[model samples]
Target: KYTIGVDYGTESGRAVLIDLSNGQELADHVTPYRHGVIDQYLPNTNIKLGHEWALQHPLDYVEVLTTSVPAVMKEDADDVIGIGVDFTACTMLPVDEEGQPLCLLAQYKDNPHSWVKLWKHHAAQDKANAINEMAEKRGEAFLPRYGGKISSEWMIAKVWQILDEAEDVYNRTDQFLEATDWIVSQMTGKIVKNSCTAGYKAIWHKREGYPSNEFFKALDPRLEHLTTTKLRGDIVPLGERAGGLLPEMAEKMGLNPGIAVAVGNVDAHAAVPAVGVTTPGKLVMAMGTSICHMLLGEKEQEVEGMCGVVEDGIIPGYLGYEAGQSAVGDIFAWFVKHGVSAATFDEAQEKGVNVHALLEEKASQLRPGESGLLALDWWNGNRSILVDTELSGMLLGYTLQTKPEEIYRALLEATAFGTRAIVDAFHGRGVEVHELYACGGLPQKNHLLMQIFADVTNREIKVAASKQTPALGAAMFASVAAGSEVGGYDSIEEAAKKMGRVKDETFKPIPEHVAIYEKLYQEYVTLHDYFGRGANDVMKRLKALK
Candidate 1:
């Protein structure tokens, strides 16, 4: 039997075909979004997007179906038994009554609010802050489980943003669906919500369901009964088959009808099993444009700054916990894009290496604290622990003697500090994080960054062997959904032990470097609480100045 996993990422969508017998990936294809993310200006409209806003065209999703899936299937024409999908969570779209994205409607063509809000969009920070404040004031039970705050990246905040900014779009929206759910709905012709996303991103608890209608009413009258209205749906568990593929979708994707379609999942959640981690204390960091730190625990523990803890959110038997740093590679990418000089760029080009690689090579040679630079990795704002999207990044103790590589290494260390903060938060809350597993675009690309993380966190780092960890994980779950009767495994854990990939190479913390980083970490903690935990309003003040 064969299973195809579709990974909907930040910039593109990829589809991979795997052989269930030996867990070999037969073929894979990636389709980059034509418009990428539609944030700056809405297509032809000159109307500017707000600060930290990001959006995507729904057609980009359709393009994934029309292109990548069939491309992979055409490359490996086997008996494809199942299909699974995982997406960047909270990448949501407001859809019409017929479940079509509002951006697909001609009347809403120029309306930015009608398009998909990508997961990284922090434009709704104010709204999220308001939600968090209200939830805490009312003692909403769900808020504590989510680290005492709701992120601008979640469903509620984004939905409220749309309702507040574009009332017409809100009223017209029949359902606010995650991009994964929407795309899966398109394939299966069934509009169902997956429990992983519904619980973590949409605030749908397994026992209590969604937060009380009274809480929604308190948020905004327009948002009252949102769970019963726009967000209403039966929440399905991970690995459960959402539905068989629709005939039209199957035909378009060059697949047979009735192929088992697994319910949608978050990219990070799907990546858990792909690294051969099936139990508690192994934290998987999907480090890409952004970083999503995921862990599986037997029981749910409310950790401050964690995104959410959902029952059976990742593997069926474990409660999945997610926390994140809003920016990692993106922070480095921003430095390369905006801070690098022509000389450095030309030198990197001459070396036939990318700027990141060049930066890594140069930065790795520096000893800890030799640069005397400390940076806050909030260039895109804090996502975990602090959960403050409005906070900006800062570089301290930079002098004329600071080289580009020194600054680069400082930034890398800064992100490491950020990860340490998250690890500490989880451990402090009685959540045992025995090991750290690194995956996604960053880990495999830069050894220096991985080593920095290992040294900073004082823990060894295991890297995912598969280049496409999330996609492979989705395929693993797809196989689990297919079950033993269909030549597939019965559970994700069993499948992961056989199918997951991990590199033999591990980054262990160097004693000297770890000791040096300990001091820097202390400094980081001081600033983290001061700026992040409301000891000061300097970040907000700086934003106001801008």
Candidate 2:
């Protein structure tokens, strides 16, 4: 039998068709989100978004299903028995009772606040801070599970922002649902919440559920019953079957009706098992525009700047710890797009390689500490250990002698240092990230960068052979949902052993570079503390001025 896995990413969505017997991908296709990241302006409107706000058209998600799924399944979908989906967490939309996105309705079409709030929507930082403060004052029990801080990129902050800025839109919204769950409902005609998003992004504890009505009241009287009202649903586990495929959705995808549909999962969480991680001490980095570091632990431990820790969060029996860098390849992309010299691009064209490749070729030749430059990988902002959105990036030790590639190399090293800091945080807290597992776009594209990551963190790095690990993980879940009788495993761990794999190639740390990076990392830590730990609140002060 076969299964389908759909991965809803930041800028695009992909559909992977998997053969269950041997875990080989039979077919796959991708569709770019037509509206793309809706941070600049609402599509088909002149409405502009405020700073740090990121949004997406909900229709763009459905476009992937209609476009990519059929294309991937063009080769007989008769064998496909189950389908699973994973999406970027907290990519939520305000929907009506019938589960249509608010922005799609004619009346709300032009309102920027009516659209889906993408996971990187940091404009809600003020609301996030307010929630954190009030939660601390009220002594809310769920705050510690989220590392004593809730992110602006989460569900509560985005919903509160809508209420604050667009009360009409808030009132019109019947329920705010994560994009993954919403799409699942479209497929199966069931409105259910997944355990992963509800727990990690919405402050819903596995045992206690969401925080009390009183805490919501404290945030705003309007939000008092938000959990039971706007956020109400039966939260299902990772591999549980949500429901069967709806006739209309199934017909659209050329698949048979009644195929099992697994409940939604977060993209990063799905990648864990796809890389063959089934236990504690292995940290999986879903490296892309940003980096999501996922680790399994035996028990919950409070680590600073971590995204959240949930019981049975990743795998069924272990606690999952998550943290991230707000920017990685994104920062690199920004510089390559905006700051690179014209000569570089022109010269790259002559070599028939991209400017990034040209830069890496030069950057890799420079020895560690040879550039005499250091940078903060916060062009987007710091996501981990500091948990602050107001913090901005800093580039130190630049001079007239500095070449573009040297700066490029330093920026790469800066991200490596940022990762090193995360490694140190987990290691220091006794979580023990024994080895680093790397996946997603970054690892396969840049070997030099991976070597640097290994050297700086001093941990051997393993990369996934399947470029689409999250989708593979989603397929594994779908297979589990289908059960052993249907040619699918009954448990996720069992499914992973059969489906999950990594490339034989491994990146080992270089002793000389590690020794040099150890000193440079010390400098990075000092600067990190100085800016982030309130040695001086200059980053915030600078933002205030702007």
Candidate 3:
């Protein structure tokens, strides 16, 4: 009759109890991490950490389980039949043969490498570059699956960095497991890997498995047996029962022992089904400060600058395709915070609406291309179709006559243009994206932005009903894990059909705006290619000079 989904965020984690029949949340609670992020120094030690180094105390993760789960289910806990969890991907730890994180032991306590590496940790870029170089030189087929380059924030690069900088820690590490799987193991009393993290983060293809043994040998002879040894496990699909809740964990959470525990998932990937997208053709955009564009497709195809295409990564039987803009709402925020004037603030105050609302109102009066403004939505740098963080934002066709609202509108349109590029990349490669489902903070706040996206991509946009879509999605998977025999669904698709929530009203593309934007989109493509494809390295040169 009920299930609980816990979403482990960067700063905190939240558990939501949901009704199985209609996917409505009955209760929810948050548990902030006690240690927060371990960036400046190791706790109780004066050892300094390098720049871009982000880590977490592994126990802070379990802290969520003890606190938030009980807080949410301090009710008829017996009704809770399943539990599911999702966390930021590639957040990993080095564990000994007994599955205890090396950080927990007194001998390794002072070693920073023994701590869990957070997803945003950028210290591994050099190692990521090394892996990319070796993979490219070897012509590894798996490279294209990850948009021609793997991120510094993935499992391989992080693991390699550990092996490179802290060989002792690497030697002692019996396994390098994702934080999501590690948490699920804590709940189920069985160590397991999920296909989502294994496919997207660890480069483990469903059929091809990990890249060849020799590929690891080329990266480093030390890593030759990496997949066979450290990363070994039965990588299961999403919604599969990862055994059941162990008695100790079950008692702590105030739930029945041996209830279903679904395999872990990346936060964004879990949202696809939560939005009711169980099939291909609908691209789910987790629109926040940034956007994570997720699509389901029938087959795997290479798309330049795509995140990765992993089979059964999101849904059960489809290839999950991902691409994103590193900045969307963030660009708008930057303009409002830094670009607007005193007069604009005064007008917004008088109107009793926020500055963005005032800007949207003024900007809405103008037709498409009337502002004579265009921009590249790369203030945070491009993520897809270029995959270059070195790239910088650009504003063109700006004149003295350009109003603040026009510039704001252009900024919004630029992000839409960016989304259009991703859509073209996927659709151009036969991964059809006929429609879109939008969630997260941006979709509800910006009406004009949604319309612009619909028109720019020429696809109808549906918004998620729940504010907590990711947490809701985790619950949906939990229901699948419990199965229909015990008030849950047998498959994720069935669970999604009953649980997923989308707004009834939709955003449709205006025909005239679509026609006009088609012309602007062509110009967007030209600028994208010229600046992004290395026709000119002006942006990178400028960054270097700075």
Q: Candidate 3 on 211-278: residue-level lDDT in tens?
A: 99999999899899899898888889988998899999888888889999999988999889999999
Write the residue-wise lDDT of candidate 2 on 1-546 in tens digits. 789899999999999998776667878999999999998888966777789988998888888988998999874647898999999999999999999999989999998889999998999989999999998998888887787888888999999999999999999999999998998988999798888898799897777888999999999999999988888877777888889998888888878888889889888899998888988888899898889899988877889888898876778777888998889999999999887899889999999999999999999999999999999888888878888778888999988888889999999999999998888898888889889999988998899899999999999999998867889888988988888887788999888887887888899999999999999999999999998888899999999999
lDDT of each: 0.86, 0.89, 0.91
Candidate 2's C-alpha runs over 4 A off are 32-60, 102-115, 120-123, 166-172, 337-352, 390-401, 537-546
User: What would the TM-scores of all predictions be?
Assistant: 0.89, 0.90, 0.98
Inter-residue clash pairs, candidate 3: none
> Best by TM-score, which number?
3
Better of 1 and 3 by TM-score: 3
User: 2 or 3, which is superior by lDDT?
Assistant: 3
The regions of model 1 sitting more than 4 angstroms off are 34-36, 40-55, 96-98, 102-115, 120-126, 161-172, 337-358, 389-402, 530-546
Residue 87, candidate 1: Cα error in Å is 1.8
Pairs that clash in candidate 1 = 305-385
- Give residue 128's error in model 1 in angstroms: 3.0
lDDT (tens digit, per residue) of candidate 1 on 1-546: 689888998899999988776567879999999899877898777988888989998888878978999998777554788889889989999998899999889888777898999998999999988998998889888888887877788899999999999999999999999988888888888897888889888887787888888899998887788989899889888888888889888888998887788888778888888888898888899887788898888777878788888887887877889898889888888998899788888899998988778888888888999889998999998878887779998899877777888999999999999999999888877788878999877787788889989998888899988867788888888887777887777888788777888888899999999999999989988887788878798999989999
